[PDB]
Amino acid sequence: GHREEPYLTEAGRDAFDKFCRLHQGELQLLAGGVLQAPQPVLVKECELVKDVLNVLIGVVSATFSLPESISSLLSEVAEYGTCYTRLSHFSLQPKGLVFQAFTSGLRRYLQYYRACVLSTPPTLSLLTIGFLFKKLGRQLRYLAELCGVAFPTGVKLLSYLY
Amino acid sequence: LVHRILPVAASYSAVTRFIEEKSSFEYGQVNHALAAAMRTLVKEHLILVSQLEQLHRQGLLSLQKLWFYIQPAMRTMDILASLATSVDKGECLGGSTLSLLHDRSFSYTGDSQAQELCLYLTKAASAPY
Amino acid sequence: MIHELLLALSGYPGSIFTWNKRSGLQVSQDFPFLHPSETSVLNRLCRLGTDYIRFTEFIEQYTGHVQQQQGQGGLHGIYLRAFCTGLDSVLQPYRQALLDLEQEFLGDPHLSISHVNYFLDQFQLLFPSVMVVVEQIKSQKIHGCQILETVYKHSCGGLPPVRSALEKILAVCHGVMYKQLSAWM
Amino acid sequence: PDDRSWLEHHVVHQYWTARPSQFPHSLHLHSNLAAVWDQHLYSSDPLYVPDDRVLVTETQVIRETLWLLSGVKKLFIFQLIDGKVTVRNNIIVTHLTHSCLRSVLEQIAAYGQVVFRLQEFIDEVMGPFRTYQAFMWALYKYFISFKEELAEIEKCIINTTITLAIVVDKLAPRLSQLK
């Protein structure tokens, strides 16, 4: 034998890299050389997922301060956590007193969203985080459209919220 | 994650300095009992930190678990540290800082996390009065 | 080829499967790596992913974009958002299928296009049928309670999977009507 | 070099691309019947004038047939020229001299048109009778398991020797059900 010589449809972790490198170079030529994305993968899978897990905490990571089509995948899964940041930024207060009460009532949901990460993913695939935090990030995102990040206080907030 | 666990050290140094410096008779009878009911909370923080070490020795402790464990004890020490700074700085002593604790019970009351600490501290400080 | 297609079908456009609104996803059709033999399989798979991009796009556009405010049931309004909410939950096994696919490619990287066509044959009929059912609702600006009838008449079909699938969304929209009726009576 | 070396080694490319090839082998009658018969014919002075052929081997044709019978249409070989799928004429295998081969692939193409039409019938539902809808559902139920059998044989081209007489007798109880 020698074999029937596996097609590009079959082999997919070395010819996959070859095709990825080739279409990347083709696009870079078709623009001119002002695009510049090396590495069909890199860093790893788990490292990027842990990076995004830290994005949902709403703080710094290794790729943000808070193929080449990874960025399109990465934007919606980072933008879940950049929405978590805008509710903790709406919160410090324990004038207006009922505004302090409403702001402290937000934190009882923020701690749930912070607890769901680092309990349900102990690093899964990145597409899993994209699917899982759509049914979870949406509920948080409605409240970020709600909150100012000024904001009403007194009878104006007590009547707007009713 | 190290940066968000670090305020409890700053709000432990203040409480332990207030207990040694304010136990003499130039600050008066009320400040003794006030620091005396602060002293049990210092012992309580130490009791927490020892159990976490006993857990850390088997490689079982993480920084995330450390954050979750110290979140109940962060609030208590924060109220104690801010109050101790204010009482030493303005040199308030006697019953003028037994009015201040009655006010501090009111000052943050919207979630009433701080009222229940300060009511306890007032009762203890007003026991010799 | 391997992660690229799963990237495209999930709702983020690929660079090989170029997102258009008039041809949906289309394979680039200019590589000397592709052929009429594999092209047709890729087009058949691309149907489901184009419909999935449209589904997620509509659901995102109409869920959580306002405080529910004036609002009409063709654009705003509680019934249409309820439709989007049910539409995401019926689409959950497609997400599970893509996640399962990547794990199988991790176990063995030599799997062919016949495997993915073979597993995804059961979605292959289910997505085209429900696509026009939501399309007529979107185009005609169907407002109010007529939305329930519009999906209801095509869930009186002669295809069992479409019947179960549309019936779930119709239950979701009944829920919002029932929640409002449970006070007023 | 970089990608072309990976092509030249690990991947075939000799029928899909209009690029002619020759394969070196030991030859010795058991697998050189085509060239031996060609030399016999040429010595008799036909007068040569052969057909254009691009030299595809045997095992590529297997995968193309399994694709046709699974229900995917419009491939490189067995492409329609009247509406009916018919095998390409650029084929010579190094034995059988393509006279047994054209007959066997011709019968298999005659099979492929029948399932081509049915998959076309299912296709025209992707773009009120209620009985047609329940008809294509059962047709579909045959097609999923049938396609699984075809794809399984496609896997065993990747991981032992497969030949024509294996796929015909293996698909005997399906060519019964197709009639």
mmCIF file of N, CA and C in Angstrom, chain D residues 102-178:
data_model
loop_
_atom_site.group_PDB
_atom_site.id
_atom_site.type_symbol
_atom_site.label_atom_id
_atom_site.label_comp_id
_atom_site.label_asym_id
_atom_site.label_seq_id
_atom_site.Cartn_x
_atom_site.Cartn_y
_atom_site.Cartn_z
ATOM 1 N N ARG D 102 -16.796 1.322 -18.043
ATOM 2 C CA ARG D 102 -17.857 2.179 -18.555
ATOM 3 C C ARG D 102 -19.232 1.532 -18.405
ATOM 4 N N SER D 103 -19.308 0.201 -18.474
ATOM 5 C CA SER D 103 -20.573 -0.502 -18.308
ATOM 6 C C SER D 103 -21.034 -0.492 -16.851
ATOM 7 N N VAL D 104 -20.111 -0.761 -15.912
ATOM 8 C CA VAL D 104 -20.509 -0.809 -14.505
ATOM 9 C C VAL D 104 -20.861 0.587 -13.990
ATOM 10 N N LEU D 105 -20.084 1.608 -14.376
ATOM 11 C CA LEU D 105 -20.402 2.959 -13.936
ATOM 12 C C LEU D 105 -21.636 3.489 -14.648
ATOM 13 N N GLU D 106 -21.934 2.951 -15.834
ATOM 14 C CA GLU D 106 -23.140 3.337 -16.546
ATOM 15 C C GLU D 106 -24.391 2.815 -15.847
ATOM 16 N N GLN D 107 -24.361 1.553 -15.387
ATOM 17 C CA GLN D 107 -25.482 1.037 -14.597
ATOM 18 C C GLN D 107 -25.634 1.802 -13.283
ATOM 19 N N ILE D 108 -24.511 2.157 -12.652
ATOM 20 C CA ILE D 108 -24.586 2.886 -11.385
ATOM 21 C C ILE D 108 -25.106 4.314 -11.598
ATOM 22 N N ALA D 109 -24.789 4.923 -12.745
ATOM 23 C CA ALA D 109 -25.340 6.240 -13.067
ATOM 24 C C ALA D 109 -26.840 6.165 -13.341
ATOM 25 N N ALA D 110 -27.277 5.075 -13.985
ATOM 26 C CA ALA D 110 -28.706 4.825 -14.154
ATOM 27 C C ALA D 110 -29.411 4.674 -12.812
ATOM 28 N N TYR D 111 -28.727 4.106 -11.820
ATOM 29 C CA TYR D 111 -29.257 4.132 -10.459
ATOM 30 C C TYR D 111 -29.277 5.535 -9.872
ATOM 31 N N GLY D 112 -28.250 6.330 -10.175
ATOM 32 C CA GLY D 112 -28.113 7.634 -9.549
ATOM 33 C C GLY D 112 -29.175 8.624 -9.989
ATOM 34 N N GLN D 113 -29.681 8.467 -11.217
ATOM 35 C CA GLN D 113 -30.729 9.374 -11.694
ATOM 36 C C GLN D 113 -32.036 9.206 -10.912
ATOM 37 N N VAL D 114 -32.344 7.973 -10.493
ATOM 38 C CA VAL D 114 -33.586 7.683 -9.777
ATOM 39 C C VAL D 114 -33.605 8.343 -8.399
ATOM 40 N N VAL D 115 -32.478 8.328 -7.687
ATOM 41 C CA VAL D 115 -32.397 8.993 -6.390
ATOM 42 C C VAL D 115 -32.146 10.492 -6.546
ATOM 43 N N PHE D 116 -31.533 10.907 -7.662
ATOM 44 C CA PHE D 116 -31.387 12.308 -8.035
ATOM 45 C C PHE D 116 -32.747 12.988 -8.154
ATOM 46 N N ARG D 117 -33.694 12.313 -8.812
ATOM 47 C CA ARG D 117 -35.045 12.845 -8.977
ATOM 48 C C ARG D 117 -35.780 12.968 -7.642
ATOM 49 N N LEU D 118 -35.587 12.000 -6.743
ATOM 50 C CA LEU D 118 -36.294 12.016 -5.463
ATOM 51 C C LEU D 118 -35.745 13.092 -4.534
ATOM 52 N N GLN D 119 -34.419 13.256 -4.520
ATOM 53 C CA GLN D 119 -33.822 14.343 -3.754
ATOM 54 C C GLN D 119 -34.201 15.697 -4.340
ATOM 55 N N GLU D 120 -34.417 15.759 -5.656
ATOM 56 C CA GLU D 120 -34.972 16.958 -6.278
ATOM 57 C C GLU D 120 -36.406 17.231 -5.819
ATOM 58 N N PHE D 121 -37.201 16.170 -5.637
ATOM 59 C CA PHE D 121 -38.559 16.327 -5.117
ATOM 60 C C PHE D 121 -38.557 16.865 -3.690
ATOM 61 N N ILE D 122 -37.620 16.393 -2.864
ATOM 62 C CA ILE D 122 -37.473 16.945 -1.515
ATOM 63 C C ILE D 122 -36.943 18.380 -1.573
ATOM 64 N N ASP D 123 -36.072 18.674 -2.550
ATOM 65 C CA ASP D 123 -35.512 20.013 -2.746
ATOM 66 C C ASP D 123 -36.599 21.040 -3.031
ATOM 67 N N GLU D 124 -37.599 20.663 -3.818
ATOM 68 C CA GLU D 124 -38.657 21.611 -4.157
ATOM 69 C C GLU D 124 -39.680 21.821 -3.035
ATOM 70 N N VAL D 125 -39.447 21.259 -1.850
ATOM 71 C CA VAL D 125 -40.195 21.609 -0.649
ATOM 72 C C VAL D 125 -39.439 22.626 0.205
ATOM 73 N N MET D 126 -38.117 22.715 0.060
ATOM 74 C CA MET D 126 -37.343 23.807 0.639
ATOM 75 C C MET D 126 -37.589 25.133 -0.067
ATOM 76 N N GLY D 127 -38.176 25.105 -1.258
ATOM 77 C CA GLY D 127 -38.562 26.306 -1.969
ATOM 78 C C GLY D 127 -39.642 25.988 -2.983
ATOM 79 N N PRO D 128 -50.465 24.057 0.422
ATOM 80 C CA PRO D 128 -51.331 23.097 1.115
ATOM 81 C C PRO D 128 -51.719 21.896 0.255
ATOM 82 N N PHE D 129 -51.075 20.756 0.512
ATOM 83 C CA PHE D 129 -51.496 19.482 -0.055
ATOM 84 C C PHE D 129 -51.575 18.442 1.056
ATOM 85 N N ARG D 130 -50.646 18.541 2.017
ATOM 86 C CA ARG D 130 -50.531 17.801 3.281
ATOM 87 C C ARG D 130 -50.200 16.320 3.120
ATOM 88 N N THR D 131 -50.358 15.776 1.915
ATOM 89 C CA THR D 131 -50.023 14.381 1.670
ATOM 90 C C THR D 131 -48.651 14.273 1.030
ATOM 91 N N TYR D 132 -48.313 15.241 0.172
ATOM 92 C CA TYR D 132 -46.942 15.408 -0.297
ATOM 93 C C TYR D 132 -45.998 15.666 0.870
ATOM 94 N N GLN D 133 -46.449 16.481 1.833
ATOM 95 C CA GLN D 133 -45.646 16.805 3.010
ATOM 96 C C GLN D 133 -45.368 15.566 3.848
ATOM 97 N N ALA D 134 -46.354 14.679 3.962
ATOM 98 C CA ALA D 134 -46.181 13.415 4.660
ATOM 99 C C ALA D 134 -45.482 12.365 3.807
ATOM 100 N N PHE D 135 -45.366 12.605 2.502
ATOM 101 C CA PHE D 135 -44.702 11.688 1.582
ATOM 102 C C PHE D 135 -43.190 11.905 1.594
ATOM 103 N N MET D 136 -42.769 13.171 1.508
ATOM 104 C CA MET D 136 -41.341 13.483 1.531
ATOM 105 C C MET D 136 -40.728 13.180 2.894
ATOM 106 N N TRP D 137 -41.553 13.178 3.945
ATOM 107 C CA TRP D 137 -41.126 12.810 5.293
ATOM 108 C C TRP D 137 -40.672 11.350 5.365
ATOM 109 N N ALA D 138 -41.449 10.434 4.782
ATOM 110 C CA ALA D 138 -41.039 9.032 4.717
ATOM 111 C C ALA D 138 -39.865 8.826 3.760
ATOM 112 N N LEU D 139 -39.861 9.556 2.636
ATOM 113 C CA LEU D 139 -38.740 9.498 1.693
ATOM 114 C C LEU D 139 -37.438 9.895 2.372
ATOM 115 N N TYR D 140 -37.528 10.954 3.166
ATOM 116 C CA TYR D 140 -36.454 11.436 4.003
ATOM 117 C C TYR D 140 -36.001 10.377 5.009
ATOM 118 N N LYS D 141 -36.964 9.646 5.591
ATOM 119 C CA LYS D 141 -36.637 8.616 6.577
ATOM 120 C C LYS D 141 -35.844 7.471 5.961
ATOM 121 N N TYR D 142 -36.121 7.139 4.696
ATOM 122 C CA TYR D 142 -35.232 6.212 3.990
ATOM 123 C C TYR D 142 -33.851 6.827 3.780
ATOM 124 N N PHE D 143 -33.826 8.119 3.420
ATOM 125 C CA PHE D 143 -32.593 8.736 2.939
ATOM 126 C C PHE D 143 -31.537 8.885 4.027
ATOM 127 N N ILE D 144 -31.942 9.131 5.278
ATOM 128 C CA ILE D 144 -30.937 9.371 6.326
ATOM 129 C C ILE D 144 -30.114 8.104 6.615
ATOM 130 N N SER D 145 -30.787 6.960 6.760
ATOM 131 C CA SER D 145 -30.098 5.703 7.042
ATOM 132 C C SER D 145 -29.304 5.231 5.833
ATOM 133 N N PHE D 146 -29.872 5.436 4.637
ATOM 134 C CA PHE D 146 -29.184 5.069 3.406
ATOM 135 C C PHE D 146 -27.875 5.846 3.247
ATOM 136 N N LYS D 147 -27.944 7.171 3.433
ATOM 137 C CA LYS D 147 -26.772 8.040 3.394
ATOM 138 C C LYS D 147 -25.738 7.649 4.448
ATOM 139 N N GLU D 148 -26.198 7.174 5.615
ATOM 140 C CA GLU D 148 -25.270 6.682 6.636
ATOM 141 C C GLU D 148 -24.460 5.482 6.149
ATOM 142 N N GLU D 149 -25.118 4.537 5.460
ATOM 143 C CA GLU D 149 -24.398 3.390 4.885
ATOM 144 C C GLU D 149 -23.333 3.842 3.882
ATOM 145 N N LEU D 150 -23.719 4.775 2.997
ATOM 146 C CA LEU D 150 -22.775 5.308 2.008
ATOM 147 C C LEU D 150 -21.569 5.984 2.671
ATOM 148 N N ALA D 151 -21.820 6.801 3.698
ATOM 149 C CA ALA D 151 -20.753 7.548 4.362
ATOM 150 C C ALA D 151 -19.828 6.633 5.161
ATOM 151 N N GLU D 152 -20.369 5.538 5.693
ATOM 152 C CA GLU D 152 -19.553 4.541 6.382
ATOM 153 C C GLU D 152 -18.546 3.889 5.431
ATOM 154 N N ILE D 153 -19.001 3.555 4.216
ATOM 155 C CA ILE D 153 -18.074 3.041 3.201
ATOM 156 C C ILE D 153 -17.057 4.111 2.800
ATOM 157 N N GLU D 154 -17.466 5.374 2.851
ATOM 158 C CA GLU D 154 -16.523 6.454 2.586
ATOM 159 C C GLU D 154 -15.438 6.562 3.643
ATOM 160 N N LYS D 155 -15.786 6.288 4.901
ATOM 161 C CA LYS D 155 -14.778 6.224 5.953
ATOM 162 C C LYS D 155 -13.785 5.101 5.683
ATOM 163 N N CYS D 156 -14.277 3.949 5.215
ATOM 164 C CA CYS D 156 -13.292 2.881 5.001
ATOM 165 C C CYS D 156 -12.432 3.051 3.729
ATOM 166 N N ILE D 157 -12.525 4.176 3.015
ATOM 167 C CA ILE D 157 -11.477 4.584 2.081
ATOM 168 C C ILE D 157 -10.352 5.315 2.822
ATOM 169 N N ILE D 158 -10.637 5.875 3.992
ATOM 170 C CA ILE D 158 -9.643 6.596 4.775
ATOM 171 C C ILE D 158 -8.822 5.644 5.637
ATOM 172 N N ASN D 159 -9.486 4.724 6.321
ATOM 173 C CA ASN D 159 -8.796 3.774 7.179
ATOM 174 C C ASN D 159 -8.975 2.363 6.635
ATOM 175 N N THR D 160 -7.685 -0.232 4.843
ATOM 176 C CA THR D 160 -7.865 -1.451 4.068
ATOM 177 C C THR D 160 -8.289 -1.158 2.634
ATOM 178 N N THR D 161 -8.044 -2.130 1.757
ATOM 179 C CA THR D 161 -8.401 -2.030 0.348
ATOM 180 C C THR D 161 -9.909 -2.189 0.164
ATOM 181 N N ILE D 162 -10.494 -1.305 -0.653
ATOM 182 C CA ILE D 162 -11.894 -1.372 -1.059
ATOM 183 C C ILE D 162 -11.919 -1.433 -2.585
ATOM 184 N N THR D 163 -12.861 -2.201 -3.140
ATOM 185 C CA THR D 163 -12.988 -2.329 -4.588
ATOM 186 C C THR D 163 -14.466 -2.305 -4.978
ATOM 187 N N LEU D 164 -14.717 -2.466 -6.285
ATOM 188 C CA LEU D 164 -16.057 -2.318 -6.859
ATOM 189 C C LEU D 164 -16.995 -3.430 -6.401
ATOM 190 N N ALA D 165 -16.502 -4.668 -6.424
ATOM 191 C CA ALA D 165 -17.312 -5.817 -6.048
ATOM 192 C C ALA D 165 -17.703 -5.808 -4.579
ATOM 193 N N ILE D 166 -17.033 -5.021 -3.748
ATOM 194 C CA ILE D 166 -17.469 -4.886 -2.371
ATOM 195 C C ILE D 166 -18.663 -3.941 -2.264
ATOM 196 N N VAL D 167 -18.622 -2.787 -2.947
ATOM 197 C CA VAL D 167 -19.701 -1.810 -2.787
ATOM 198 C C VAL D 167 -20.987 -2.282 -3.456
ATOM 199 N N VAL D 168 -20.892 -3.043 -4.558
ATOM 200 C CA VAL D 168 -22.113 -3.519 -5.221
ATOM 201 C C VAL D 168 -22.866 -4.517 -4.335
ATOM 202 N N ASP D 169 -22.153 -5.515 -3.800
ATOM 203 C CA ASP D 169 -22.859 -6.500 -2.988
ATOM 204 C C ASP D 169 -23.243 -5.931 -1.629
ATOM 205 N N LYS D 170 -22.510 -4.927 -1.136
ATOM 206 C CA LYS D 170 -22.945 -4.303 0.106
ATOM 207 C C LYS D 170 -24.217 -3.488 -0.087
ATOM 208 N N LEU D 171 -24.413 -2.882 -1.261
ATOM 209 C CA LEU D 171 -25.614 -2.086 -1.486
ATOM 210 C C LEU D 171 -26.719 -2.861 -2.195
ATOM 211 N N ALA D 172 -26.569 -4.183 -2.308
ATOM 212 C CA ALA D 172 -27.681 -5.036 -2.738
ATOM 213 C C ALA D 172 -29.018 -4.829 -2.004
ATOM 214 N N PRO D 173 -29.120 -4.810 -0.661
ATOM 215 C CA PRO D 173 -30.464 -4.675 -0.065
ATOM 216 C C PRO D 173 -31.026 -3.261 -0.083
ATOM 217 N N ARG D 174 -30.316 -2.300 -0.666
ATOM 218 C CA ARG D 174 -30.833 -0.960 -0.888
ATOM 219 C C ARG D 174 -31.309 -0.767 -2.320
ATOM 220 N N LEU D 175 -30.606 -1.374 -3.281
ATOM 221 C CA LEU D 175 -31.051 -1.354 -4.669
ATOM 222 C C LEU D 175 -32.302 -2.190 -4.878
ATOM 223 N N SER D 176 -32.592 -3.109 -3.957
ATOM 224 C CA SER D 176 -33.911 -3.725 -3.910
ATOM 225 C C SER D 176 -34.968 -2.703 -3.514
ATOM 226 N N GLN D 177 -34.704 -1.937 -2.454
ATOM 227 C CA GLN D 177 -35.715 -1.035 -1.911
ATOM 228 C C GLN D 177 -35.924 0.197 -2.790
ATOM 229 N N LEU D 178 -34.977 0.489 -3.685
ATOM 230 C CA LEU D 178 -35.069 1.657 -4.561
ATOM 231 C C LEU D 178 -36.088 1.456 -5.682
#
